[PDB]
Design a protein around this ligand. Structure first.
Ligand SMILES: CCCCCCCCCCCCCCCCCC(=O)OC[C@H](COP(=O)([O-])OCC[N+](C)(C)C)OC(=O)CCCCCCCCCCCCCCCCC
Ligand SMILES: CCCCCCCCCCCCCCCCCC(=O)OC[C@H](COP(=O)([O-])OCC[N+](C)(C)C)OC(=O)CCCCCCCCCCCCCCCCC
Ligand SMILES: CCCCCCCCCCCCCCCCCC(=O)OC[C@H](COP(=O)([O-])OCC[N+](C)(C)C)OC(=O)CCCCCCCCCCCCCCCCC
Ligand SMILES: CCCCCCCCCCCCCCCCCC(=O)OC[C@H](COP(=O)(O)OCCN)OC(=O)CCCCCCCCCCCCCCCCC
Ligand SMILES: CCCCCCCCCCCCCCCCCC(=O)OC[C@H](COP(=O)(O)OCCN)OC(=O)CCCCCCCCCCCCCCCCC
Ligand SMILES: CCCCCCCCCCCCCCCCCC(=O)OC[C@H](COP(=O)(O)OCCN)OC(=O)CCCCCCCCCCCCCCCCC
Ligand SMILES: CCCCCCCCCCCCCCCCCC(=O)OC[C@H](COP(=O)(O)OCCN)OC(=O)CCCCCCCCCCCCCCCCC
Ligand SMILES: CCCCCCCCCCCCCCCCCC(=O)OC[C@H](COP(=O)(O)OCCN)OC(=O)CCCCCCCCCCCCCCCCC
Lengths: 318, 98, 105, 80, 114, 115, 70, 175, 347
């Protein structure tokens, strides 16, 4: 019975990833004064099916100079970590109701970097090494500020449980008292997933393709669905953190519709940002978070740890 | 005692005999140091959580902090070495034999 | 040398984490609070040389509470004897030890 | 010091905002009168069981029943 | 060492309060108010004796008083308490704030009748 | 019980999508297709050469900072203690020491990249 | 025009509507028409185990009311 | 055999320790240490310390990632050894695994072993406590008492970290 | 190095040693040891030459291994005792591991290999700071756990350290290696008498610190690193030759100098416990330390080695160095015998 629950969790997110490829292509085309795919089917509904069937009947092309074991393990680890880290999200009831879901998602987001790193190192190429080291630089740029942002915004919730975050935002949204943390969190989620303007790993300008330049079709699709499932999970995580919707225990479909449309708007905002900005340099991103975001994050952390004591508004931990 | 205590102590001894016989590479010795630190952390928190000594739960995490207080330091003792010589072999560190 | 600064100035620095019978948060007791309390109260102020042979019963009981070696030995002997009797077919498990037991509440 | 403040606000406003937020967070809890409210709110939360005392015969401050008027009440917390 | 002393299975036999956890939670406050003295005596004995084998009779009295309390509820206010504990039992976290109207009905009925 | 079931399910679903991608199509492997890609020309040297890094100092700073902010993570639960002035003072002192260390790194040109 | 991005997005909406509510439906199926009870702290787990023992069917969601007592 | 879950996780722990302590190459040593940290956090999470396991997992993942960046940068070779490219590394890995599985077989036969201490053979589930802990987890309150009680520990740790930052600045200077 | 940063680092070293000395918790002992090692590493990196990098790397590896063994023994003692009081231990394996860790931290043989190389690769200031101050905390920890050390292990370590230091001091021309081997021999001398009466150990520690500081400060004043410049010192200032002669005669255990203060009374504590072979062997082995001290005095003061022409210019410039407490330290290291019962203040 739990098998039914986990398969009904993991199949619609793959379908969502494919239709996210469709929506990304069509919306990005329409923002560039042109049209997206509409010839494959009725309004292009069959383009992701054609892409998926095409990519799984092509040659795998395992290189000779690459360590084959890590070359196979890295996309498997990427897709796996993209799968078993959707679980603690309350929709409105999570599949796994972890007591420490926030730290779990932090740890498994730290673990997903190793797939990119071992993909870059395993395939014996210089561009893959450059992409892997740029991923390392991006991780050391963003991780500490991301964790302090989460700690400062969880001081009003009471605990690390993601299920109690709806109860915290039952009266008002959490973006009203923590909007600078919300903006910094949005930039951190943009830089976490290597999305534009902080791509810097699959750079088609400075490099050819980066870490996945030696990965032909079949294994290359795994990184694509891992990245797109990652951006959907960041959108849902940001929606739960800062845009908590009204929850009725008798009608969970209201909360499901509400956070579904909010996460869709957040993904639309992601693609809106993608089409409009030039790519950051990966040394400028390093000085962005470590010099501008970090002092403000420390000041806001001290403000948010001295605020509930000041106002007799310390939230319960139960 | 128990069984997991025996396994963690065996892991500590395995990492100790990994550390004490160098293989011409400093990073491997640093990895062995991190492994022994991890084994000590795991044994300490296993004993503490078994014995319900709640006030000593400040001990392991604080302990983990001081791990970096040598481990990152070891990296800072490598870059000058890697600026003195092109590699990080331990056989190049034999100038102090006279 | 042990320059005892702490008792000289009356400043508590690390005396609260020294034992498990101290002021714990929310009065959470250790699993062997009574044994350690008895061992400390037995061996208070009499010196280590006298305490090694005069309060050995309380310290031995506390060490048995800490690691449960004799309890493991007794349980292992009982389990081994039970498995041997099962293997010889001389023993049948009781219904309350097999699952259909109907506990109290 | 107005010239220095204007120059540092024109050059690096992020550090000025961070230092102002830090200064408010440092000097503000010592000025607000609501910290003791947090103190007795945290002390009034019943994590553990209120273990009763033996009635020796002379204890006028503790009640015999929880509904007796003697004892620490929290009408202030209900009011706030 | 000495043989551990354990009471026989006849001494532990008592008619238990065989209700669910939500049934106990729904009528927790009135049970605490009405049956306070034998529970307090039992827990004082438990904290002063440090031995479950020396506090058996007080536990028996606690069970008897709780069963009498639930029997007194069952005689007069069966259906509003039924609605209240059902509404408490529906919620996953057993929240007290989700069932205020059935609660107000239950204490109104038990204040007017009892 | 459920967490390892979910882990095994996701691992099986991931690892089945490569053996399907391997054994299904028609493969044609020669000793020119699987060469390392360097924009049409064969590379000079190997990809295992020392890749001289620049941000080593900030890497060590991140090594310290990850756990030095991981000390700050029990601050929600630390708001539930009875002693609150001492907790507030110690937390403010910890983040103040963090800020002092960051400012010392900034002023001594430690965040800049070498060469 | 632009509204043709609305069909595919709508499919995405269905692709984000199916899983979570399904879990709720699963949580309304196994637990006998109620929410799946949460156990964040050991007291809640002890109450869960007491309910499972007191139901007599080895199912914790089988709620026995005040008709059980005399 | 599900009652020996912590024992199996500890077996994988010592397996990973043997895997990276043979020192083949720091990439695969880092992979082995990541696996060992994962199963160790699983062990301590099985004992109830979920926060401590998640924290040590996150900290060691970050440390191993910085380490991997360093070895890609500085400690590299033309032909790195995976595990079998060197005879001595493969040999010592094989004897480490053999000694571990020999100890497993010996402790799984008479349920007792003497390596310098004395160890049982039953699963660790016996040594658990039978009572509940109320509305709090003991490890969370214990680590939360760092600020209310451990003022001296916080002071010396913050000073040690600040001095460490200054030391890192002073060492890698060159003049 | 900035003077502010140098003052802060030296204060951190002092704070770490104080934290080890005054704490009643094992975790605080390990924290103080870690802080001491972290703040003592960059002192040796003061001049930024490769030999400092080798010395720092070797010292860091040895101290990290010692700290790991110390924490393992602390955890085992926690397992077998369930407390944290810094007192006697309740497991012989924990006592053995703590003794091995403190022997590695003290540089006692057969863990003596890093001592002469680290001492030679670092300047005289860092060498003096190491060989005098860093040998205070482990001796205090050994003082605290007195009813726990195995007698055979600590006595074997002491006699091994004395013999190895006495043998190794003969074949050196560098002054820093000579001081390192002398420190190893004195380490064995202090740990030989620890289990009988640690007041004699404290007396020997104070005397050894005074004499080592005097010799190192004289090496600062003469600006000498090798034996040849120390020989050449007779042309610049003969008073320095007189001072190093009487100091090296003091460190050889020759009465009526203060270097006869510890060793003699150490013998006075081994014959009361019916051990007559060991003090005799220890004195016979300390004759080797006296031998290379006599060789140093022959090279430096008692013979007039040839000099160069450029020293004439050094006759026109007097010394302007901050010789801090040098006459008081020389007087303490030479003429302290008739105040022998002063050591009763160390009880
Ligand atoms: C989740 C909700 C929605 C969030 C927003 C999402 C939609 C909008 C997205 C916009 C496009 C983003 C694309 C990527 C941009 C990347 C660059 C970037 O972000 O750079 C950050 C830049 C960095 O600046 P920089 O890169 O120009 O660097 C300047 C460097 N110097 C000065 C040396 C030349 O700005 C920040 O870091 C600001 C962070 C947010 C600040 C919030 C301040 C709130 C108010 C505080 C108080 C102020 C009053 C004074 C005190 C009063 C006290 C009482
Ligand atoms: C998640 C999305 C993906 C889902 C999984 C994939 C969906 C589609 C699955 C079927 C795809 C078609 C078959 C595999 C691909 C074949 C490609 C091809 O051209 O093969 C030619 C080859 C035939 O070529 P050949 O054998 O004549 O060789 C020509 C090349 N030389 C002579 C140089 C060696 O097909 C095969 O080898 C067999 C393919 C399968 C045939 C049917 C099997 C039973 C099906 C029921
Ligand atoms: C100049 C060159 C020649 C020098 C010759 C010097 C003398 C030769 C003999 C010296 C022996 C050592 C001192 C012994 C003092 C004994 C005092 C005493 O109470 O004895 C009774 C005690 C009796 O033991 P006890 O008193 O502890 O026990 C109580 C008494 N009974 C035994 C009854 C229970 O004797 C001893 O303890 C042992 C004495 C013999 C020691 C053997 C080891 C030393 C061997 C000689 C080394 C000499 C130096 C060699 C190198 C020279 C430099 C190159
Ligand atoms: C007591 C208050 C709380 C203090 C502790 C808590 C602090 C929280 C925030 C932490 C900030 C961490 C980082 C701080 C770095 C400061 C040093 C620095 O880097 O200065 C450089 C900067 C000039 O820039 P530049 O030299 O070009 O930098 C190189 C690349 N940009 O130099 C500058 O821009 C000048 C920086 C110093 C002057 C700032 C003045 C701010 C005034 C705000 C309003 C009044 C606040 C009153 C409180 C006291 C302030 C001292
Ligand atoms: C969460 C929601 C996810 C939704 C995913 C799917 C979204 C799109 C849904 C379908 C939309 C319409 C697609 C229409 C495709 C084209 C159909 C067509 O016209 O095919 C014609 C082709 C050739 O036929 P011919 O013989 O030439 O005809 C003679 C005409 N005089 O004949 C053929 O090609 C053969 C027949 C093909 C029929 C294909 C029908 C669509 C299949 C889509 C796959 C997914 C289906 C749904 C799965 C989930 C629900 C169960
Ligand atoms: C060779 C390369 C690697 C190949 C294999 C890759 C496998 C997948 C790797 C990715 C996943 C790694 C997972 C690591 C452990 C994560 C632990 C976790 O998620 O814990 C969440 C949760 C904690 O919540 P808690 O507060 O304990 O709640 C109890 C009260 N209801 O926990 C719970 O609620 C408890 C649920 C049961 C937990 C059982 C004990 C832990 C099981 C660990 C399995 C093995 C992990 C191996 C990781 C290897 C990483 C390289
Ligand atoms: C008892 C103490 C020894 C325990 C292990 C004994 C079996 C494995 C070692 C056999 C001897 C080979 C050896 O250690 O050689 C030294 C080697 C460094 O030498 P290298 O530079 O690699 O090559 C030149 C000559 N071998 O260095 C190494 O091989 C270092 C790797 C050692 C790994 C030890 C951990 C495995 C488990 C051991 C049992 C616990
Ligand atoms: C039972 C337990 C007993 C514990 C007793 C503790 C007593 C107090 C602590 C004593 C330990 C040693 C303290 C000093 C350590 C060394 C300091 C040092 O090396 O300072 C460096 C400084 C450099 O001076 P300068 O020549 O200008 O610089 C050259 C360029 N680098 O200066 C020098 O190089 C010159 C030397 C300066 C210090 C000399 C005086 C102090 C050390 C000797 C002790 C003197 C007697 C007092 C204590 C008696 C008991 C030990």
């Amino acid at each position: 019975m739990f098998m039914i629950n986990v398969l009904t969790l993991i199949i619609p997110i793959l379908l969502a990833v494919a239709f996210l490829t469709l929506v990304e292509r069509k919306v990005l085309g329409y923002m560039q004064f042109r049209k997206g795919p509409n010839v494959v089917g009725p309004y292009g509904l069959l383009q992701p099916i054609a892409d998926a069937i095409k990519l799984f009947i092509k040659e795998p092309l395992r290189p000779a100079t690459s360590s084959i074991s890590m070359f196979i393990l890295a996309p498997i680890l990427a897709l796996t970590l993209a799968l078993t880290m959707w679980i603690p999200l309350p929709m409105p009831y999570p599949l796994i109701n972890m007591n420490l879901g926030v730290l779990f998602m932090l740890a498994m987001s730290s673990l997903a970097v190793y797939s990119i790193l071992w993909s870059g190192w395993a395939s014996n190429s210089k561009y893959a090494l450059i992409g892997a080291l740029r991923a390392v630089a991006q991780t050391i740029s963003y991780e500490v500020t991301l964790a302090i942002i989460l700690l400062s915004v969880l001081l009003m919730n009471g605990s690390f449980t993601l299920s109690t975050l709806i109860i915290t935002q039952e009266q008002v949204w959490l973006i009203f008292p923590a909007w600078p943390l919300a903006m910094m969190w949005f930039i951190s989620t943009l830089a976490e997933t290597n999305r534009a303007p902080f791509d810097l790993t699959e750079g088609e300008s400075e490099l050819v393709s980066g870490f996945n330049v030696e990965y032909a079709a079949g294994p290359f699709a795994l990184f694509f669905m891992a990245e797109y499932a990652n951006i959907i999970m960041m959108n849902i995580f940001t929606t739960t953190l800062f845009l908590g919707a009204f929850h009725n225990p008798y009608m969970p479909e209201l909360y499901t519709i509400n956070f579904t449309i909010k996460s869709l708007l957040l993904s639309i905002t992601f693609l809106w940002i993608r089409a409009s900005y030039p790519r950051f340099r990966y040394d400028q991103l390093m000085h962005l978070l470590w010099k501008n975001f970090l002092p403000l994050t420390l000041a806001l952390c001290m403000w948010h740890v001295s605020l509930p004591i000041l106002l007799s508004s310390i939230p319960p931990q139960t | 005692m128990s069984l997991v205590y025996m396994n963690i102590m065996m892991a500590f001894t395995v990492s100790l005999t990994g550390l004490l016989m160098y293989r011409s590479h400093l990073m491997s010795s640093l990895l062995c140091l991190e492994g022994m630190m991890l084994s000590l952390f795991i044994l300490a928190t296993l004993m503490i959580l078994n014995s319900h000594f709640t006030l000593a739960s400040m001990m392991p995490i604080i302990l983990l902090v001081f791990a970096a207080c040598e481990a990152a330091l070891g990296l800072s003792l490598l870059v000058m070495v890697s600026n003195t010589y092109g590699t990080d072999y331990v056989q190049n560190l034999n100038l102090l034999q006279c | 040398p042990f320059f005892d600064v702490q008792k000289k100035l009356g400043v508590d620095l690390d005396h609260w984490m020294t034992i498990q019978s101290a002021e714990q948060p929310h009065r959470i007791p250790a699993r062997c609070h009574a044994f350690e309390k008895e061992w400390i109260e037995c061996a208070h102020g009499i010196g280590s040389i006298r305490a090694e042979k005069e309060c050995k019963i309380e310290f031995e009981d506390f060490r048995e509470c800490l690691l449960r070696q004799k309890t493991m030995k007794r349980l292992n002997a009982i389990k081994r004897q039970r498995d041997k009797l099962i293997k010889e077919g001389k023993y049948t498990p009781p219904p309350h030890h097999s699952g259909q037991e109907d506990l109290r509440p | 010091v107005a010239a220095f403040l204007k120059n540092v606000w024109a050059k690096e406003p992020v550090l000025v905002a961070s230092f102002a937020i830090a200064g408010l967070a440092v000097i503000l809890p010592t000025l607000s009168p609501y910290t003791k409210y947090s103190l007795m709110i945290n002390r009034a939360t019943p994590y553990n069981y209120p273990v009763p005392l033996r009635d020796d015969g002379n204890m006028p401050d503790v009640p015999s029943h929880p509904q007796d008027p003697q004892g620490p009440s929290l009408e202030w917390l209900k009011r706030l | 060492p000495g043989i551990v002393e354990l009471p026989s299975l006849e001494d532990l036999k008592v008619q238990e309060v065989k209700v669910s956890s939500s049934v106990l939670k729904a009528a927790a406050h009135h049970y605490g108010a009405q049956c306070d003295k034998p529970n307090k005596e039992f827990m004082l004995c438990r904290w002063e004796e440090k031995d479950p084998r020396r506090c058996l009779e007080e536990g028996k009295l606690v069970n008897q008083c709780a069963l009498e309390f639930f029997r007194q509820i069952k005689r007069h206010c069966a259906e509003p308490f039924t609605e209240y504990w059902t509404c408490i039992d529906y919620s996953g976290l057993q929240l007290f704030r989700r069932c205020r109207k059935e609660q107000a009905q239950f204490d109104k009925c038990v204040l007017d009748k009892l | 019980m459920n967490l390892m079931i979910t882990l095994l399910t996701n691992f099986t679903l991931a690892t089945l999508l490569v053996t399907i991608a391997f054994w299904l199509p028609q493969l044609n492997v020669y000793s020119e297709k699987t060469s390392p890609y360097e924009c049409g020309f064969d590379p000079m040297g190997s990809a295992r050469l020392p890749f001289s890094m620049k941000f080593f100092l900030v890497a060590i700073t991140f090594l310290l900072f990850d756990l030095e902010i991981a000390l700050l993570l029990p601050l929600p639960w630390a708001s539930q203690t009875t002693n609150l002035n001492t907790m507030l003072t110690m937390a403010l002192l910890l983040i103040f020491l963090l800020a002092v260390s960051l400012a010392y790194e900034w002023t001594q040109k430690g965040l800049e990249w070498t060469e | 025009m632009w509204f043709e991005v609305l069909p595919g997005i709508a499919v995405m909406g269905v692709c984000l509507f199916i899983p979570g509510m399904a879990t709720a439906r699963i949580h309304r199926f196994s637990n006998g028409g109620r929410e799946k009870r949460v156990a964040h702290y050991s007291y809640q787990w002890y109450l869960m185990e007491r309910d499972r023992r007191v139901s007599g069917v080895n199912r914790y969601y089988v709620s026995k009311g005040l008709e059980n007592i005399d | 055999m599900m009652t020996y879950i912590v024992f199996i996780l500890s077996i994988i722990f010592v397996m990973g320790f043997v895997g990276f302590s043979s020192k083949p190459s720091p990439i695969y040593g880092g992979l082995g240490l990541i696996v060992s940290g994962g199963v160790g956090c699983g062990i301590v999470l099985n004992f109830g310390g979920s926060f401590l396991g998640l924290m040590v997992f996150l900290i060691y993942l970050g440390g191993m990632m910085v380490v991997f960046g360093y070895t890609t940068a500085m400690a590299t070779e033309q032909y790195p050894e995976v595990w079998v490219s060197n005879k001595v590394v493969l040999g010592t890995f094989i004897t480490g695994l053999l000694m571990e599985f020999l100890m497993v077989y010996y402790v799984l036969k008479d349920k007792e072993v003497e390596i310098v201490f004395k160890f049982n053979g039953m699963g660790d589930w016996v040594i658990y406590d039978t009572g509940d802990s109320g509305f709090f987890s003991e490890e969370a309150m214990g680590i939360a008492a760092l600020y209310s009680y451990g003022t001296w520990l916080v002071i010396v740790t913050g000073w040690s970290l600040l001095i460490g930052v200054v030391v890192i600045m002073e060492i890698t200077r060159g003049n | 190095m900035n003077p502010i940063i140098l003052i802060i680092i030296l204060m951190t070293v002092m704070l770490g040693t104080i934290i080890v000395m005054i704490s009643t918790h094992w975790l605080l002992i390990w924290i103080g040891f870690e802080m001491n090692m972290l703040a003592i590493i960059p002192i040796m990196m003061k001049k930024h030459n490769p030999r400092a990098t080798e010395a720092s790397t070797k010292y860091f590896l040895t101290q990290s291994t010692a700290s790991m063994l110390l924490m393992m023994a602390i955890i085992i003692n926690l397992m077998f005792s369930g407390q944290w009081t810094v007192m006697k231990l309740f497991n012989p394996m924990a006592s053995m591991l703590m003794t091995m860790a403190l022997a590695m931290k003290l540089g006692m043989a057969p863990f003596h290999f890093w001592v002469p190389e680290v001492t030679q690769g670092i300047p005289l200031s860092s060498g003096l700071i190491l060989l005098t101050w860093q040998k205070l905390a482990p001796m205090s920890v050994l003082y605290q756990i007195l009813p726990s050390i195995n007698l055979d292990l600590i006595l074997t370590l002491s006699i091994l350290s004395i013999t190895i230091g006495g043998w190794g001091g003969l074949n050196q021309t560098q002054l820093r290696k000579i001081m390192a081997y002398s420190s190893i021999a004195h380490m064995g001398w202090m740990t030989a008498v620890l289990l009988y009466n640690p007041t004699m150990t404290l007396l020997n520690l104070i005397i050894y610190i005074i004499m080592t500081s005097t010799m190192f400060t004289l090496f600062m004043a003469n600006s000498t690193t090798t034996t040849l410049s120390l020989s050449h010192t007779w042309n610049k200032a003969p008073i320095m030759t007189i001072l190093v002669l009487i100091t090296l005669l003091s460190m050889g255990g020759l009465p009526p100098l203060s270097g006869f203060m510890p060793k003699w009374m150490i013998i006075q504590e081994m014959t009361k416990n019916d051990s007559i072979i060991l003090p005799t062997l220890m004195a016979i082995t300390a004759l080797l330390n006296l031998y290379f001290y006599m060789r140093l005095t022959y090279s430096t003061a008692l013979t007039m080695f040839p000099s160069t022409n450029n020293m004439k210019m050094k006759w026109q410039f007097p010394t302007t160095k901050r010789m801090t407490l040098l006459p008081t330290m020389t007087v303490l290291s030479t003429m302290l015998l008739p105040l022998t019962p002063i050591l009763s203040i160390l009880e």
